[PDB]
Amino acid sequence: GRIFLDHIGGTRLFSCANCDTILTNRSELISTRFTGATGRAFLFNKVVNLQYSEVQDRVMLTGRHMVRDVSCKNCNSKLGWIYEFATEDSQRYKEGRVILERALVRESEGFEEHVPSDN
Amino acid sequence: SQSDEDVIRLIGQHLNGLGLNQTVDLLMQESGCRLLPPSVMLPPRRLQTLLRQAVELQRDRCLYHNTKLDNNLDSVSLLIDHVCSRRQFPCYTQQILTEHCNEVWFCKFSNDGTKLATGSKDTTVIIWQVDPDTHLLKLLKTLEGHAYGVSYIAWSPDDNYLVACGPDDCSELWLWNVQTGELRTKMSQSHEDSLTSVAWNPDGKRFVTGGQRGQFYQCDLDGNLLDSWEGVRVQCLWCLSDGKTVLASDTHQRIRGYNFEDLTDRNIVQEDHPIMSFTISKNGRLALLNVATQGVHLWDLQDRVLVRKYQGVTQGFYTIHSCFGGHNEDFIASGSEDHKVYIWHKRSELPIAELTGHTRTVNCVSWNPQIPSMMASASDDGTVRIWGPAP
Amino acid sequence: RLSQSDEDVIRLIGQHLNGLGLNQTVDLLMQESGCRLPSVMLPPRRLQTLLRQAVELQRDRCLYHNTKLDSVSLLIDHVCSRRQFPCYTQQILTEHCNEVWFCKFSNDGTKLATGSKDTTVIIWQVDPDTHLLKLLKTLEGHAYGVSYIAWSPDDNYLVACGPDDCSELWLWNVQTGELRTKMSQSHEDSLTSVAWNPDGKRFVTGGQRGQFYQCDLDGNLLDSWEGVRVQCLWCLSDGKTVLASDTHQRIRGYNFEDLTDRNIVQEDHPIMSFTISKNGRLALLNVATQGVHLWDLQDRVLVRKYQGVTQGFYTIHSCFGGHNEDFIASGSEDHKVYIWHKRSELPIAELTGHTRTVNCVSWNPQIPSMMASASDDGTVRIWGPAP
Ligand SMILES: [Zn+2]
Ligand SMILES: [Zn+2]
Ligand SMILES: [Zn+2]
């Protein structure tokens, strides 16, 4: 059937680099000092129309975590991962956030939303 | 006893109102009873109230109820309990149309139940004529030329033209002349557009189209652009019967109304979850909504309140459409992702029927506007099933 | 001119009078109405069925209908009064020294267990006739206080947990008031929830640090799960599934035997606590900074949102109750007890009498007129019908 695609709105939008379906915007950004597999990676707050696979435990630069792989809802291409559990207490601020690889997303300019007249 | 005395007194009071007096006098003379404490004086018209309550309870449990004669308190037989005839309920498949060579995406009727339009992923639209004396569907003509498939079909008020759209990121739409079977205009403004929703003006000479990239146009028959709006990512559109009001649902979970003549906008609905599709009733008073990861909702367009929430349907990954239907619009029909069709009555939230027989997803469901015993369901396996009364 | 509707009622009245034990006025009525024998043989006892249907309709609309046959007067509509609904304080229990954090009735509604902020759990026995509560047992040794209490399915054992960052739990037997094994796995654990197994021989415990265990009566560890920070637990009736609410604002079902997990509820605000109806189909849950929400687990759909309770940060517990679980009771931070009927989102009562915040409310399962309320002022209130 026709896959339902959401929209988050705003300015400075991010999109999947393969099919150009929006994922998030600049507003929901936390830290850009992250490293993935293809280079630098970004940590966001909320990402729309993603997919999730299964819980896997692995060792990273800061302790041991359990994560899930994420992928585009329209083209089925891997974009990053999402945290579920973090063993190190200090590393709990990223418990439910999403990392996307900067080489797999594209930035675009989106117009400001028309502000309702509240009528 | 005492319950017998109450019945005797109430029967006497009721009989005294039908012009009988000797019978009442002899009944009060042989039983021994007699007619603001209830012993001092009896309430007025109590037996009639009890009988009306009994008839109302009989109507409440009527499963397939018809509400046309719900305003007539009298004129219902008391000798036998009331039950409607489900003989005309469409709960048995009787025809399987399999001529699309790919998965089917949309189905619609022709505003009078004479023709049925089907649109599928194999880049074609098929029209089926309905035989009036048999209720049998036969192919009439095929319309080809689409590229990415057909996802939304809109009928003209006089059923002389129709408009076919495409899926996401399709920047053109087709307008077909249905009498001669030829193409009139294929409209496209810019290569970066996206037109996924279309609706017709009640006068049948203009139509409003829109998409999720910020495009919201009102156009003529020849494809000429007439009006434009900026700053809205529309998903579903509908034109009100006054001729100068367009209801549009956006990505902020709103169903706001707009006026192109004087450039005005209002606030109507506000949902807690994303909205896929909606349809308004015949008199433009109620709205039926398909909500992501939730059920099917009903809203009042004047009081601006939620009326009921219907459960049992699964959705959220695919786009699914529903419809009003039945005699005087008493039933609600919808598809789902679990390979079956759900039917609800307006009086209850739980489903009445769960019709199975499809092997893959059910995307759209269409009721016949003028034949209340005809439904069509298009599935995600290449089939269109026609449902009618059981044998 | 008597129309068709009149004739049917006339024949019904004639049949009823003839069958009642009278034989004169029926003949006199026929001799004047002039109509008598489907129009051949009337159904037997039509008026009785019609009047019973009317009485059933009258009973359907009754609001404060907590009640558990031609005994109803036909001259006036039937209404259950509010003074019979439990809305008036009947007992004030003042035996705890510091505070009260949790109160719970037994599964057969014979005893009440209240856990205080100081080191005490108190058991009250309910008289069956006069419905009065009397202390019978006191249990001591909970160094950090008691915040959660769970009853065995046959009301022979109860498990009492502590507050946050407490690495122990206690297991008593009610019959003799003695102490079974005091379970403690790791010195740096935190156990704050517990749920029993319908066979009554195993339980499941968990905590915020990431502990999720299934253990036996002797205290041994049978199973453990890693990667979840549970907040509230409940074992289903089938004896395999455990429903747990996590810190990701969702409820998930877990299967220890096959080691599987699925999703059921996804919300947008923290879930402080939840409870599940008797048939295991509906979940009533408390949402932080919002009201009380009802969820259908089989269909996974939010049904109703009840408004009126203030709850910002603290944990507040609500409950089902009524004649057939048609009523919802809850506490709130504004010193009041709230009661709703399932058909509307507006409260049908707003009780009062507590000095400080109320944080536990319970309904008697076997006596649908007794409510227990526990608050931070050091007293417990037993609510019943008006005198
Ligand atoms: Zn993609
Ligand atoms: Zn009916
Ligand atoms: Zn009652």
PDB file of C-alpha atoms and ligand atoms in Angstrom, chain A residues 16-21 72-77 79, ligand 1:
ATOM      1  CA  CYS A  16      17.450  10.845   3.694  1.00  0.00           C
ATOM      2  CA  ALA A  17      20.223  11.205   1.119  1.00  0.00           C
ATOM      3  CA  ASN A  18      18.794   8.462  -1.137  1.00  0.00           C
ATOM      4  CA  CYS A  19      15.064   9.194  -1.531  1.00  0.00           C
ATOM      5  CA  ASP A  20      14.778  12.634   0.158  1.00  0.00           C
ATOM      6  CA  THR A  21      12.201  11.922   2.859  1.00  0.00           C
ATOM      7  CA  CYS A  72      14.690   4.787   6.353  1.00  0.00           C
ATOM      8  CA  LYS A  73      10.992   3.918   6.181  1.00  0.00           C
ATOM      9  CA  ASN A  74      10.791   4.417   2.396  1.00  0.00           C
ATOM     10  CA  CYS A  75      14.077   3.077   0.970  1.00  0.00           C
ATOM     11  CA  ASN A  76      15.241   0.712   3.765  1.00  0.00           C
ATOM     12  CA  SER A  77      18.760   2.118   4.110  1.00  0.00           C
ATOM     13  CA  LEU A  79      21.121   5.652   8.916  1.00  0.00           C
TER      14      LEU A  79
HETATM   15 ZN    ZN D   1      15.403   6.863   2.389  1.00  0.00          ZN
END
